[PDB]
Design a protein around this ligand. Sequence first.
Ligand SMILES: *[C@@H](CC(=O)OCC)[C@H](C[C@@H]1CCNC1=O)NC(=O)[C@@H](CC(=O)[C@@H](NC(=O)c1cc(C)on1)C(C)C)Cc1ccc(F)cc1
Ligand SMILES: *[C@@H](CC(=O)OCC)[C@H](C[C@@H]1CCNC1=O)NC(=O)[C@@H](CC(=O)[C@@H](NC(=O)c1cc(C)on1)C(C)C)Cc1ccc(F)cc1
Lengths: 304, 304
Amino acid sequence: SGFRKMAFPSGKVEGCMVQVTCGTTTLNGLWLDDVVYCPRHVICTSEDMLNPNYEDLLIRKSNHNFLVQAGNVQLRVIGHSMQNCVLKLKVDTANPKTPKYKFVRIQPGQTFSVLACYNGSPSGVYQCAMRPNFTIKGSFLNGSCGSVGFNIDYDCVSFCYMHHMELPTGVHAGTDLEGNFYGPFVDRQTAQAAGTDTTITVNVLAWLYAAVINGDRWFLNRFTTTLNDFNLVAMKYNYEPLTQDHVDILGPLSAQTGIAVLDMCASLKELLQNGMNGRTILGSALLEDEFTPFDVVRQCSGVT
Amino acid sequence: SGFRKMAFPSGKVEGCMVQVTCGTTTLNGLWLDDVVYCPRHVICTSEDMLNPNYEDLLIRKSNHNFLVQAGNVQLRVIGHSMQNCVLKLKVDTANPKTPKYKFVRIQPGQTFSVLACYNGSPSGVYQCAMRPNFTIKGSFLNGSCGSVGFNIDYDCVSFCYMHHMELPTGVHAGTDLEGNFYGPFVDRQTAQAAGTDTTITVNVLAWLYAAVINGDRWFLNRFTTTLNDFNLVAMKYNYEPLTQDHVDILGPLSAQTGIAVLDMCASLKELLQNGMNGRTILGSALLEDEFTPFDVVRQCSGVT
Ligand SMILES: *[C@@H](CC(=O)OCC)[C@H](C[C@@H]1CCNC1=O)NC(=O)[C@@H](CC(=O)[C@@H](NC(=O)c1cc(C)on1)C(C)C)Cc1ccc(F)cc1
Ligand SMILES: *[C@@H](CC(=O)OCC)[C@H](C[C@@H]1CCNC1=O)NC(=O)[C@@H](CC(=O)[C@@H](NC(=O)c1cc(C)on1)C(C)C)Cc1ccc(F)cc1
């Protein structure tokens, strides 16, 4: 038993991380088959970043302006292509460590593992969520860009995130592996509004089932509610509305514990109204929303 | 910027994980060179676990009663030895993925990465601390035993932990890689008292520095204090006393921020006395103690 913020094992992704250099700019790239993927802003001089014309800037680059190091081995870049906000660098070598992989675009509320890298070297692995406003609360310093987020489905790495930017508020923004930003964000150093960040209500409920499974039950009350009563209270507290799809997703946890979703909604309504009164749930003094119902089922069934 | 509970990349340790089977009992093993390391309780039937005589049970086993699977490859066991609470199985094949490695015994308050495994397969990586009472707040299910904890110093993997036990209180106990238990625990299904779990004061201070670096300053107060004033208050709140070694170790963070250790001690004293009043620090509604000063330096400098 016990419950922790758990990342997927990072090994299959470590063997894909290379260093991409263009003039001063050194950041991380993802080496799958004979293609290296990185942020297209590797081609920007800090001055460009104000208002970059990425076509005009890329046009003035040759294959040879791009330095790719895989450990100590140099990869010959034999092609440079722009797909939305990512650079695709064709290389002379297929990566022999390439795992089975897909590119996915994840939805708000979904979690992924981030392999935080600097100079194409892995430093750290942490789990986080796509926030409803399509930001992530990550840990990223200078050189971290091109760090990827991924899920693992047995043998298949599903890449969902590539890190491009921090907003002045200290939260993070990036793209799927086809170079489309999550959220209304652009790869430009100008004022960008995130949106009001709401709580992921379905995830809070899954974490409350996590809590009951680990013997933390003090917040289980007598009452019940409706999807409509609950949502009317939830919106007051900047919580995402709960839909029937959310209730059906919470089904297995409901069945395991013998607590109906709408009884757990009734308990969460209390916690929002009356507060936690200084009691912790699974060692946290606040309601946690960065665990999906799959994340909870993984870690209370032990999927490998 | 940003700040997360971050595990080391798990790749080098994934390459060492094997499944060990003895009669019914299946659990995880660590394969370094031509030796497999696992919990000695692999030889116990659930009935034995009440009061096991490990000599009498081991005596009745031969090299061929031991099935080691490394993915699909069966390893031929050519020798079996007991060192404290671990089995050493001599195998015909040195592990070609053996990294540079040490066995270290960590101190209370130090952090490590856990690679949670089932049937010799990696499922997840999370960071935690050796509690002052020599327990860990982990996530382990049935089959998790032989899962290891490690630190990584560039290319060298320092193994510090092998999981053996959950206590009835839902916290965890295990050994160093020479099979010595952390704390007063034995590998038996009998009543074992953990000890009073205190807060790791040096880690709380490092985390407060982490907070100031990330723009979270609201708790920086007017006062100062002495090592003795602070410690006198710290003991009242079940915090570990702060020593000169702790002040010296907090030096880099002190220098970075221009905030002297005893000024941060003075701030922490207030938080203990007044409580947190419902505000958060780095997204937590309580004082976090599972980040060392090295962990904070790692993540506010980006060591790779
Ligand atoms: C990754 C790239 C890098 O380090 O370059 C190689 C040397 C890096 C990661 C972030 C910096 C520290 N924390 C991070 O997450 N990203 C950058 O270097 C970009 C930094 C930004 O994201 C800036 N964003 C803005 O300029 C901005 C300001 C406002 C109001 O809205 N957006 C913040 C640090 C402010 C640099 C960059 C790259 C590409 C761009 F199109 C713009 C900026
Ligand atoms: C790992 C062993 C494994 O993989 O089994 C091989 C098939 C596993 C870890 C725990 C299971 C649940 N979560 C865990 O972290 N260990 C066990 O299966 C042991 C179970 C325990 O540790 C029990 N502890 C006690 O028996 C106990 C009771 C008291 C007062 O103090 N300690 C808990 C389930 C309660 C089984 C085991 C192994 C070795 C032993 F010496 C005794 C018991």
